[PDB]
Amino acid sequence: HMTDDKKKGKFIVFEGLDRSGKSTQSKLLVEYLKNNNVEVKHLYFPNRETGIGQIISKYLKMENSMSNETIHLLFSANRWEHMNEIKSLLLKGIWVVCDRYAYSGVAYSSGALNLNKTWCMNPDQGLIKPDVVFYLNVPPNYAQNRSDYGEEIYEKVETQKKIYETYKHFAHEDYWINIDATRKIEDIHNDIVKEVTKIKVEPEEFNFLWS
Amino acid sequence: HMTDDKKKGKFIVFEGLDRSGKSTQSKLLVEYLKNNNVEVKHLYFPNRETGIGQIISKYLKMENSMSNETIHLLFSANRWEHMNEIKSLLLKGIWVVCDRYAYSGVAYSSGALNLNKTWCMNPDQGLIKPDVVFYLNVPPNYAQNRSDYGEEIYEKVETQKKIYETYKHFAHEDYWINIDATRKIEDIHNDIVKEVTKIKVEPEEFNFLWS
Ligand SMILES: Nc1ncnc2c1ncn2[C@@H]1O[C@H](COP(=O)(O)OP(=O)(O)O)[C@@H](O)[C@H]1O
Ligand SMILES: Nc1ncnc2c1ncn2[C@@H]1O[C@H](COP(=O)(O)OP(=O)(O)O)[C@@H](O)[C@H]1O
Ligand SMILES: Cc1cn([C@H]2C[C@H](O)[C@@H](COP(=O)(O)O)O2)c(=O)[nH]c1=O
Ligand SMILES: Cc1cn([C@H]2C[C@H](O)[C@@H](COP(=O)(O)O)O2)c(=O)[nH]c1=O
Ligand code: NA
Ligand code: NA
Ligand code: NA
Ligand code: NA
Ligand code: NA
Ligand code: NA
Numbered sequence: 001h002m003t004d005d006k007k008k009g010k011f012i013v014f015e016g017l018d019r020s021g022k023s024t025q026s027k028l029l030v031e032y033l034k035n036n037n038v039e040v041k042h043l044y045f046p047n048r049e050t051g052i053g054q055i056i057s058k059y060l061k062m063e064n065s066m067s068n069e070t071i072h073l074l075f076s077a078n079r080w081e082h083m084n085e086i087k088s089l090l091l092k093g094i095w096v097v098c099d100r101y102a103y104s105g106v107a108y109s110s111g112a113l114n115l116n117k118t119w120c121m122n123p124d125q126g127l128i129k130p131d132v133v134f135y136l137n138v139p140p141n142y143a144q145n146r147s148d149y150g151e152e153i154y155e156k157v158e159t160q161k162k163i164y165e166t167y168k169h170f171a172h173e174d175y176w177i178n179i180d181a182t183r184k185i186e187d188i189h190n191d192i193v194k195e196v197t198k199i200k201v202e203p204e205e206f207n208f209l210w211s
Numbered sequence: 212h213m214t215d216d217k218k219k220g221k222f223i224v225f226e227g228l229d230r231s232g233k234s235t236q237s238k239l240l241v242e243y244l245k246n247n248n249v250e251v252k253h254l255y256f257p258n259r260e261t262g263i264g265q266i267i268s269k270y271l272k273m274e275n276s277m278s279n280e281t282i283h284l285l286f287s288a289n290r291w292e293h294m295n296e297i298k299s300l301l302l303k304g305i306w307v308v309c310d311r312y313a314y315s316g317v318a319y320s321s322g323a324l325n326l327n328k329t330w331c332m333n334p335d336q337g338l339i340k341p342d343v344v345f346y347l348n349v350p351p352n353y354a355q356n357r358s359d360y361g362e363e364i365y366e367k368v369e370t371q372k373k374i375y376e377t378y379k380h381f382a383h384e385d386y387w388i389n390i391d392a393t394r395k396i397e398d399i400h401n402d403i404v405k406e407v408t409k410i411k412v413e414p415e416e417f418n419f420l421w422s
Contacts, residue, residue: 051266051275052266052281052285055262055263067291067292067294069288069291069337070263070288070292073287073288073291073334074263074285074288076284076334077280077284077288080278080281080284081278083280084278119336119337122333122336123287123333123334125330126280
């Protein structure tokens with residue numbers, strides 16, 4: 001009752017290759033939720049505004065160079081420093097719609113940096129687990145013509161090919177919903193809405209990666 | 212031969228409670244090695260001068276506050292960004308004498324922050340393993356009168372008591388050498404020298420935590 005510590009909002013993550021449409025789709029979903037009287041906050045990773053995120057942003061823009069393990073652990077620490085906020089929102093009944101999470105961490109590091117997958121998962125163990133992940137599936141060559149593509153470190157077609165394969169580490173999980181993202185914006189969004197309307201709305205216990 | 216990738220220097224770590232004499236002893240050992248014609252570099256963790264180390268230094272000085280997991284992972288990332296340097300030194304035949312390493316990470320986080328020990332070890336898995344660790348053993352109340360004690364976050368006797376117990380996670384390992392550090396500087400140093408002279412001097416393969 002008073003000490004109720006149940007998760008009341010839902011936590012939805014978008015995952016996908018670079019420029020696959022995650023910001024596009026997460027903003028449309030947020031607007032749809034607001035229109036159906038659901039309180040919701042839009043979050044994303046990496047958050048480049050924190051001290052850790054600033055270092056990350058320099059890495060992505062090739063303004064610095066860092067060893068594979070060092071940058072992998074910063075991407076994870078950047079999520080941890082948001083756990084208090086995500087937990088509080090969800091306890092309040094506010095939904096969280098989030099562009100990228102720990103699945104990006106594992107897929108990008110194991111595919112682009114060739115880090116060991118179990119080693120990559122470890123530091124994200126214990127993060128709050130989302131209700132669903134929409135994976136905006138595009139082939140590795142598909143998005144190379146969209147606006148700023150090639151500006152940041154992983155945006156080369158040969159790297160995207162590797163990350164496309166390591167995203168399959170999650171492809172058969174029950175929380176993972178493959179979405180064909182080589183379609184019109186509105187078609188993709190309608191599929192996402194269809195899936196979101198099946199989410200069961202009741203307060204429940206928090207769960208944690210990698211359960 | 213030409214592609215020889217053998218570890219040629221030795222890697223010695225000092226561990227110990229706050230103000231237990233690690234900088235004192237590591238400088239004396241460095242001077243002793245130089246006097247016996249051994250090339251050596253003195254390193255220490257956290258390195259507060261990097262981008263990551265700056266954030267760490269603010270945490271230790273209570274200039275910011277951070278969640279337990281976030282700061283734990285930064286302490287680990289701070290070691291990783293030194294692996295290229297430590298590896299190169301050791302390949303060259305330069306010894307590395309280092310004030311604190313991954314054992315501090317595990318002992319401080321599991322003792323002061325109550326983090327799960329296996330979770331704390333994971334991100335340091337894969338770091339280069341030292342030849343020996345001297346643990347400058349002092350009781351948890353012992354150092355409270357030494358110069359700047361109480362300036363930084365963990366320097367309260369009740370926290371030191373907890374970290375004293377979690378340093379025992381390594382107490383029975385073959386690389387771990389307990390040194391009674393409640394003695395005169397010169398007596399402690401003579402014990403360390405005695406142990407250092409038993410190290411076998413030949414080139415060998417690198418080993419890695421937590422083997
Ligand atoms: N399905 C789509 N069809 C055409 N253009 C799209 C589609 N989805 C997104 N875009 C455009 O592609 C670019 C990248 O989209 P964005 O949502 O920013 O990708 P991400 O967040 O995955 O990097 C933007 O210019 C966006 O307007
Ligand atoms: N064995 C000792 N006896 C008396 N004073 C010592 C001894 N070892 C170190 N000190 C003094 O204690 C303080 C902390 O020593 P330091 O080597 O800086 O500790 P740490 O590096 O472990 O924090 C310094 O003022 C140092 O001169
Ligand atoms: C969240 C996360 C993102 N990334 C990559 C995915 C993108 O290439 C870049 C983030 O940029 P974005 O989401 O604008 O594309 O960071 C990681 O490598 N590890 C992570 O943990
Ligand atoms: C290297 C390391 C140090 N620490 C603590 C030990 C000290 O209290 C502080 C470092 O300060 P120092 O070595 O001057 O004392 O950081 C950690 O908590 N985790 C680590 O991984
Ligand atoms: Na990108
Ligand atoms: Na985005
Ligand atoms: Na699925
Ligand atoms: Na200290
Ligand atoms: Na020191
Ligand atoms: Na021993």
